Design a binder for this molecule. Structure first.
Ligand SMILES: [Zn+2]
Lengths: 76, 74
């Protein structure tokens, strides 16, 4: 049903949404402890966080996964 | 619990490329920014557990399928 599709889309990638919030801090923590340059680490994270964000599944990916699960029958 | 395993298999497969690409993206980003091939490998391989610990795992797929109604609590 459509209700079941909405619910699947709401929770399927929840683990990624949780983690995405902490990626900038974690990247900064890793960088600073290794490269020890706060200024350069701030630049690294700002310039390259977008690459990780692009790996986080989006709502369209949730739809397609939930279709694979058989719950989203709609195309979108 | 075949439906549970089906659900987890699907989620784990949907996540796999992002899971495997996360450390590679950091490695590629490091090479493009800090340049040093030697120190970039060390950085990624042993010095960013804070970031790699954030990558979802099978246990998270299980809990997701629990939320969906097809898996029991682990
Ligand atoms: Zn089983």
């Amino acid at each position: 049903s459509d209700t079941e599709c909405h619910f699947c889309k709401s929770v399927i990638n929840q683990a990624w949404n949780t983690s995405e919030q902490a990626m900038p801090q974690a990247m900064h923590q890793a960088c600073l402890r290794f490269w020890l340059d706060r200024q350069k680490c701030e630049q690294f994270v700002e310039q390259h966080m977008p690459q990780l964000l692009a790996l986080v599944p989006r709502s369209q990916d949730a739809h397609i996964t939930c279709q694979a699960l058989g719950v989203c029958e709609a195309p979108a």
